[PDB]
Every structure is written in structure tokens, then in C-alpha cells.
Design an enzyme around this catalytic site. Structure first.
Site, PDB file in Angstrom:
ATOM      1  N   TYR C 119       0.839  -1.204   0.000  1.00 25.67           N
ATOM      2  CA  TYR C 119       0.000   0.000   0.000  1.00 25.67           C
ATOM      3  C   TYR C 119       0.873   1.253   0.000  1.00 25.67           C
ATOM      4  O   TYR C 119       1.993   1.230   0.500  1.00 25.67           O
ATOM      5  CB  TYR C 119      -0.952  -0.008   1.200  1.00 25.67           C
ATOM      6  N   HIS C 127      -6.710   1.557  -0.823  1.00 24.36           N
ATOM      7  CA  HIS C 127      -7.802   1.033  -1.629  1.00 24.36           C
ATOM      8  C   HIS C 127      -7.300   0.183  -2.773  1.00 24.36           C
ATOM      9  O   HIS C 127      -8.105  -0.398  -3.514  1.00 24.36           O
ATOM     10  CB  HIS C 127      -8.638   2.184  -2.218  1.00 24.36           C
ATOM     11  N   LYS C 158      -4.185  -6.155 -13.005  1.00 26.06           N
ATOM     12  CA  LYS C 158      -3.354  -7.072 -13.803  1.00 26.06           C
ATOM     13  C   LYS C 158      -1.956  -6.492 -14.019  1.00 26.06           C
ATOM     14  O   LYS C 158      -1.441  -6.417 -15.135  1.00 26.06           O
ATOM     15  CB  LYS C 158      -4.027  -7.499 -15.123  1.00 26.06           C
TER      16      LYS C 158
END
EC number: 4.6.1.16
Lengths: 184, 168, 180, 161
Positions: C119, C127, C158
Site C-alpha cells: 500500500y 484502496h 493485472k
């Protein structure tokens, strides 16, 4: 069920076997979902032009079942046992092979698991037909694994069907671990 | 012989010890094309382009047509079945690839970028390290590092693989 | 400038003071509450469980004081041995370290079928992490493993990451799906 | 405020004082506390819950003492708690690392694995057959390196079904 007899010739080139006669091509695909067409990813049943590519382990299997005659590009014949050599010479293929044989011999239709992140995708009737209840990963019972990998599995199986199988193999025998999420 | 089969081919070629040689051009524009993009230069066709144009049925190799002809060049010249596939795919998509200078690589330009594709085949393990030095390699020459994986069945996937010192 | 004390038990270090537990989770998102899986930011009581890899980094950075059940002091190198002593944790630690230093908050990748979730601000805020699988450049892989990965990152983003590390140096392989 | 106090033996926990009579009565009932002897894992659980004291040590400080004192595995204990919270009643099983519990008139065998501690796949299969050959439903419990616990049922079979 009982499809028909057979029936089909292919060239051994690289680690795979190509089938270039269109009818043979559709023949095999339609009669057990073997092979993979090189002009279509996800065929309308069996309207495609081919050639049909067969994976080396597919090859040995079909040869075994007296369905495929494999030839080299020079025209010269390739034995069942020649194929058994080439497969036994590749650790991945080698471990794969006995699980395929067993699974096909149990009457399942076995396909590449690649798109579900695993070794085999396994259908009752076949792709486009049913859904593939099972996702298989292949293992020698001497393989080490971190327990989190078991979860990763339950992950992979998250979106398709929380139920995946571990297929373990040695000395040509196979046993499978059913693993599905669980609430104590 | 009796009757050569020249109907349907846009040209006919023989397989020499090293190389495919075009002997007959039946559609001029087709040959002229295969010269403008550089694959065919004075009858000499580049082995993959030669396997390719076979597999479209546009190039005969004697009395042999289509994929039986593709397999012929391919086996004959000692090519790699997967590379050839990734090539065909790339030709079919509108790209004109050449053999990169490194083992197992294909190079192609498009939209002002040169793309270097490494072809890998299920069953043929490679060290992660190598994947890194190759991508590095690639980046240093100003190619975008591409990886094409052909699974055991023939399916092809494409992934950019960019090496970096820190995520971003 | 937070300071907290923990007890090395098994291969982890438990933080038992409520204020310290909450403190680390709030100032850098370290540790995992035992009384709350996904804590909404911070009502949670702990104890905070810290990974061995977390225990090293923080001891190093001077924020955590670690001790054994009997109160005797466990030093930085004690942890570093135990960490080096474990193969999976020794390869993770290097990457952990490199990413924390660069200023990323690094959480477990479990729920994403990988090693790390990464993160920029924090879980429950950012998020949208990075997904990181860890490898020593001498680790052999089948090329399909690159596809299983692109599959794993199909839901999140991806674009996942092979993090390669040996003898303390780390590089990163940005993978992400491509259309010729 | 503890409902009980206990002291650490050499291989056991032993309740020394029952501040709340009802609390101990209940414990005997479900069969964890017997003749002074509180089962190590339940003993730790009560400490965690702040119910049990260890001398004057309270809560998870209390528990840390038991687990480390009796040399229990942190991961097994966390699992044990979790299953207790959920309202099950396990007990240290035969096989190594296993807790056993009953529910729905079924017997579930839980095997506790931890990130960082590899096992051979054969082993897992074996254990799995062992569980079925005891009419134990084979449940694997994984605890990642951070304390997250996940459960799965793991069944070995000769033909996919």
C-alpha cells in the site's frame, strides 16, 4: 458413452504433435475434446480449420489407445515408446502424465488449467458444454510446500468454484486431495 | 511430373540446405509486398516468414501446401515450433517481426516503439535471474520487454515484463 | 517517535499494551490484531501480533523492544539470526525491508494469494495495493507460473510484481498483461 | 477481576482458588477442569479472556506464561481460542499438532499449519487418510505469519468426486 473408433495421424515436431488433416482435427476434438486448434482459442464446438495441436502427454495417451499414429517430419514412424521416452524426459510432463491418464481413464475430459491458474481443468461433459467442477494442481508426494500455498489454492478456486484438488503421483499411482473452504 | 499444382498459391518455393528460395511469383503484388517489408530479398525468404506464408496457404514448397509445408520449412531449417507460432500470431495481428539477436527472441516495431519478445514454453524452466538480465538487456537497447508464453497445448499469452530498481 | 515492547513467543512478537498495539497499527500499519481481522482503522484491543520480519525491521528502526517470556532481553541480532534461520522469512525480510524503507506500507499478501500486499497510504485507505511474489534470482520457474500470476492479478490490478533478491540486493519485475 | 487463580506445575496447570464457584463448576461440567487440573490450552484460553489469573498475572500476560511455560505452540493456541470463541469444545488430539472436537454429532480433526514451516505433500495426504480412518473429518487450519487463520476441509480420495 461410445463415440467411435479411430483413426488419426499427426506429425511429431518440437515437444508437441500437430494434426493437419481437417477431418481428423475436428474428429478428435468432437470425440473427447482432445487437442487444441491453432486458429481458434475457444471453438464453437468443432468448427475450426486447425491444425489441432496435441500436447506431448495427450499424444502418448492417444497413441497408447491406438488412436493416433505419430510420424516425424521425414515421414518416419514414432513409437508409442518413443513418446514414452520424450515424456519421461521432462519432469513436469512426467508428473502430469500419470494424472492425465488416470483422469481420462476415469472418463473425465481433461483440459489445460492455464486460464484458472492450475495444471488441469476437468469437465464431466466438456468445455462450452458443462462448467469444469474441478481445478487440479499436480504434485509429487516428495514436494515441499508452505501451508499458505494451500490457501492460495482456495484463492484460485475462490472465483470459479471454491473446490480444487491436489493430485499427487508416484510410481504411476494417483490420489487426490479435495480441499474446500470450511467454517468451524 | 504430369501437372504441377500452382492453383491457389501466390508463389512457389524450394527448400535448400539453408533457406527457402522463391522460384515462381504468380501474384506480383504479393511478392512485391514481401520485398517492401524486407522478408523476401531476391528470392531468399526468411525461414519464419516462409513457414508463415506456407500456413496461410499462399506459398507452396514444391507440391507441398499449407501446414504440411510449414512443418517442412520448420523442421527442415531447425526452427522452433513455439517461436513460429508467436510469429504467426504476430504476423496475423499486423506486425512484421524479425529474429532478435538474443536466443529465443523476436523483434518488431510499431507505433514508434520497438518490441522485444522472449518466447517461453511450458515444461522449459528458466531462472528468475535470467528473466531479469534479459528484461534489463532488452530495456538497455530501447526495446519494451515482452514475454510470450505458449502453454503445453499451444495457447499464447503476452506480458510486458519491466525490470526496475524500485516499484513505481 | 512511538515506542513499544513485545514478547517473542514462537516465531512472533506479541504487543500487549493496548496503547502501543494501536500505536504501531496507526503509525505505519504494523502488525495484526488478534481480536480483529480487518480492524476499522483502530478500535481494537489487541494484542498486536507482529511477524518475525516485522519484529526485525522495527527493532532495527528502534521502535520495538523485544523480550522473551521470562523478561530477558532479545537483541537485534538475536532476531536477525532467527530470521536468517528461516528460509522463507529470510527472503521476505530483504524485500520487506527494501519496500518499507522506500516508504511503502507492506501487509500480508495472503488474501491475494501472494507474499505481500503493498500500500502507498494504508490498508482501508489506499484502496489499491501492489501484489508481490518473492524469488531468489536462482529460483527456477516454469513459464506458466508467469501466467498463473497474471491470472492472480486479474481481479485486483493485472499488474503484479516479481521481487528478486539475493544477499540483500533487490530488483523488481513489473509484469502486466499486453496486447501486441 | 479474575473468577479464578491457578499456579504452574511442571507438566500442568492447577487451579488454586475459585473466586466464583459457578465458574469452576461450569468448567468441570464440559470436562476441561478435573481434580484441580485445568487442561493447558483451556487454561491459556481463560487467561486470555481475563477470567483466569496466574498468581497475580492477568490476561494475555497470564496466557503467554502458560503457553511458553508448558511449551505450547502459539499457533495451535490461537486456533484453539478461535474455535472456542466460535463456541466449539476441542481437546488436544492424538496426532502431532492436532486438536479434536465434536459438533453436529460429528468428529472434526484439525491440523494446525504455519506459514514458514513447510510440509511434504505426501504427509498431508497421509494425515488426511489417517483422519478418515478414524472417522475424523479432516480439517486443516492455516495460520499465516501474521496471525490470520483460515480453515479448509482436506479429504483424500482415490477417484475425484
Amino acid at each position: 458413452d461410445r463415440c467411435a473408433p479411430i483413426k488419426a495421424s499427426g506429425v511429431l515436431i518440437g515437444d508437441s504433435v500437430l494434426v493437419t488433416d481437417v477431418e481428423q482435427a475436428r474428429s478428435l476434438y468432437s470425440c473427447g475434446y482432445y487437442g487444441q486448434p491453432l486458429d481458434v482459442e475457444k471453438p464453437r464446438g468443432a468448427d475450426f480449420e486447425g491444425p489441432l495441436r496435441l500436447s506431448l502427454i495427450e499424444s502418448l495417451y492417444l497413441a497408447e489407445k491406438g488412436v493416433l499414429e505419430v510420424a516425424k517430419p521425414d515421414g518416419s514412424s514414432v513409437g508409442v515408446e518413443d513418446l514414452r521416452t520424450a515424456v519421461r524426459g521432462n519432469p513436469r510432463f512426467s508428473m502430469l502424465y500419470n494424472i492425465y491418464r488416470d483422469l481420462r481413464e476415469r472418463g473425465f475430459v481433461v483440459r489445460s488449467g492455464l486460464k484458472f491458474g492450475s495444471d488441469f481443468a476437468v469437465y464431466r461433459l466438456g468445455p462450452g458444454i458443462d462448467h469444469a467442477p474441478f481445478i487440479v494442481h499436480a504434485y509429487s508426494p516428495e514436494d515441499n510446500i508452505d501451508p499458505v500455498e494451500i490457501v492460495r489454492a482456495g484463492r484460485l478456486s475462490h472465483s470459479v468454484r471454491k473446490k480444487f484438488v491436489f493430485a499427487v503421483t508416484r510410481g504411476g499411482d494417483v490420489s487426490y486431495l479435495m480441499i474446500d473452504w470450511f467454517r468451524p | 511430373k504430369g501437372e504441377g499444382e500452382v492453383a491457389g498459391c501466390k508463389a512457389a518455393a524450394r527448400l535448400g540446405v539453408e533457406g527457402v528460395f522463391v522460384e515462381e511469383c504468380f501474384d506480383g503484388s504479393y511478392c512485391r509486398n514481401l520485398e517492401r517489408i524486407g522478408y523476401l530479398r531476391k528470392g531468399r525468404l526468411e525461414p519464419l516468414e516462409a513457414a508463415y506464408q506456407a500456413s496461410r496457404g499462399m506459398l507452396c514448397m514444391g507440391e507441398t501446401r499449407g501446414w504440411a509445408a510449414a512443418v517442412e520449412v520448420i523442421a527442415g531449417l531447425g526452427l522452433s515450433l513455439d517461436t513460429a507460432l508467436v510469429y504467426f500470431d504476430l504476423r496475423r495481428k499486423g506486425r512484421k517481426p524479425l529474429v532478435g539477436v538474443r536466443r529465443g527472441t523476436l523483434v518488431y516495431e510499431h507505433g514508434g516503439r520497438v518490441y522485444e519478445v522472449l518466447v517461453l514454453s511450458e515444461g522449459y524452466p528458466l531462472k528468475i535471474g535470467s528473466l531479469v538480465e534479459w528484461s534489463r538487456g532488452a530495456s538497455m537497447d530501447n526495446h519494451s520487454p515482452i514475454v510470450a508464453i505458449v502453454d503445453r497445448t499451444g495457447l499464447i499469452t503476452y506480458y510486458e515484463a519491466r525490470a526496475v530498481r524500485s516499484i513505481q
